[PDB]
């Protein structure tokens, strides 16, 4: 159907005609398989809810203290590959920053792409820190396994290679499942995650050194949605800084190659601009008609280079860039 489910498996209002029901599946996941057993609580939350009530959940009903950092793990949705040493230094710097600041890590949650590299980081850690995931309910594999009120449900690492559904990573410490009513479609978690990050960043911290509880959002590769969310990050009030990691490709390498040769934002020479446009059109296989639109969106991003922080490997972990952008985006 339009919701993507089976025609006989049933039982936004535009074309899906949803009815607003109370929540029914929430509790604790026992992760059997995949090495060590890890307990991770989960709550199904509708995508159009108020963020203060999720804040009250995470403070009172979850016994999680208010952190000093929010290391977002936004990246490419599809599964990719990286250098082994680059992934190792990425994971070491990520867990080092997570233990030094006591951060909450907003990893995507489904085990495809940069989320699997976050799971590789937590395998290096292997011993607090929160790893709250924001993944859609419609895309998680074995949806019937996670049905139950306050029940410790078994969740295996069963991942069919031909199934469209993706199993969650087994070593997140917590989970939020954004339910818009549909199955197998993305976009159900983005707006809820943005309003959650905004409502957390409006909270005044106990130390109050900067401006409330600070957020540092990290990008590895990504599509045009990565460029759009960096544009949303920089134009945000307050202006949350962005750490990008090159040596990987896609939008992050284009952002770093621009940032090395941009000077005062729009001060880019003609040959470098044409090279960036042709690598957008051919290396990332984007459309040439929207290449100029992505270039001017990149220029709107590029007007605020004082918060974009890059990391070039070549010891020298990513936590240097994380703490440097933390001190930049604090006022």
């Amino acid at each position: 159907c339009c919701c993507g489910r089976l025609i006989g498996q049933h039982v936004w209002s535009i074309s899906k005609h949803t009815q607003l029901s109370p929540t029914d599946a929430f509790g604790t996941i026992e992760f059997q398989g995949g090495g060590h057993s890890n307990k991770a609580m989960y709550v199904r939350v509708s995508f159009d809810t108020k963020p203060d009530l999720l804040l009250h959940l995470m403070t009172k009903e979850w016994q999680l203290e208010l952190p000093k950092l929010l290391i977002s793990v936004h990246g490419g949705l599809q599964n990719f590959e990286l250098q082994p040493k680059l992934k190792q230094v990425f994971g070491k710097g990520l867990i080092k920053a997570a233990m030094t600041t006591g951060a909450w890590i907003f990893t995507g949650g489904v085990n495809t792409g940069v989320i699997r590299h976050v799971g590789d980081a937590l395998k290096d850690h292997a011993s607090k820190i929160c790893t709250i995931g924001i993944a859609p309910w419609g895309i998680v594999e074995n949806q019937e396994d996670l049905i139950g009120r306050d029940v410790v449900r078994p969740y295996q690492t069963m991942s069919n290679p031909m199934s469209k559904l993706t199993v969650l990573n087994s070593m997140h410490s917590h989970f939020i499942l954004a339910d818009n009513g549909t199955t197998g479609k993305y976009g159900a978690e983005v707006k809820l995650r943005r309003q959650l990050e905004k409502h957390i960043s409006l909270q005044k911290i106990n130390t109050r050194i900067g401006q409330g509880v600070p957020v540092v959002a990290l990008i590895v590769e990504g599509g045009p949605n990565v460029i759009s969310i960096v544009l949303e990050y920089l134009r945000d009030t307050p202006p949350v800084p962005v750490v990008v990691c090159d040596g990987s490709g896609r939008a992050s390498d284009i952002l770093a190659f621009g940032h090395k040769y941009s000077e005062e934002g729009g001060l880019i020479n003609e040959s470098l601009r044409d090279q960036l446009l042709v690598t957008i059109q051919k290396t990332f296989t984007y459309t040439r008609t929207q290449a100029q639109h992505l270039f001017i969106i990149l220029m709107e991003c590029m007007k605020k280079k004082e918060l974009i922080t890059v990391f070039r490997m070549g010891h020298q972990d990513i936590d240097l860039a994380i703490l440097t952008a933390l001190l930049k985006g604090a006022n």
């Binding site: 059997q32 398989g33 090495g35 060590h36 057993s37 690492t157 991942s159």
Partner: protein, 303 residues
Amino acid sequence: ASAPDQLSLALAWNRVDIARSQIFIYGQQWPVGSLEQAMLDALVLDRVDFVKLLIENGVSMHRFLTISRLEELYNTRHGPSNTLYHLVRDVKKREYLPPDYRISLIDIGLVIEYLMGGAYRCNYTRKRFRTLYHNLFEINHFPFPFHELMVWAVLMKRQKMALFFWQHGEEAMAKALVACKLCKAMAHEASENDMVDDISQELNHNSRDFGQLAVELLDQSYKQDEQLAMKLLTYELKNWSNATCLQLAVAAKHRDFIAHTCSQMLLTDMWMGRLRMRKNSGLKVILGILLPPSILSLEFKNK
């Protein structure tokens, strides 16, 4: 073929990587009781990396280890040789043997009483477990399975399995001191029967390694938090015949456990009671003994 037979061939080849890559994959329809029987075969054959694979993929060791399963682990011969037969024969001779003797959990309990010595009275020999044995040969399961499995691995010479079973679980330092005492006592029983140097030297080496694990765990616990280290060395081990780790180590004659700053500080704190007038003592103690007014000029620790 079926995945139990594939995993059986993997156990035969001693190649954990092959099973890791192919046998334990997504979609593999494991039948009822396949992993429990495979775990039994992996334990009796001493294939510790396959036990690691089967506990990583999910076998629920608490549900696996029962009365009959641990008994079958004690009567197996499909592995390394042990000195268990001589020990069971000696304790059944002293307490009062056919070659087809199905050695019971009660008899192994008597073996732990004989080797541990002193006043160690094992949970196997206790009356409640005796009525459980007399009425059955989660009630038949074991609340602390890694304890019984480490006693299994220590008692039957399986050392790498004993290290692995030491790692997983709790009350591990008490487990290490009990393992040290059992390995030393089996070494002493083998050398009193003056057999080959290999068995006595190897069991002595086993006791030295396990005691060294106990010492290095003591050092780490002392580096992290001193007060919880004192709590670790003094609490009542309900599973280890109601003693403390100090009593088990002094039973084990284990010199560099009670040589360390934690144990000596605890003994010094016990030595002088609630008295804080404890600098250049001895002479002050004698002066307080001879003079009853001399106590009132001494510092005392508060409650």
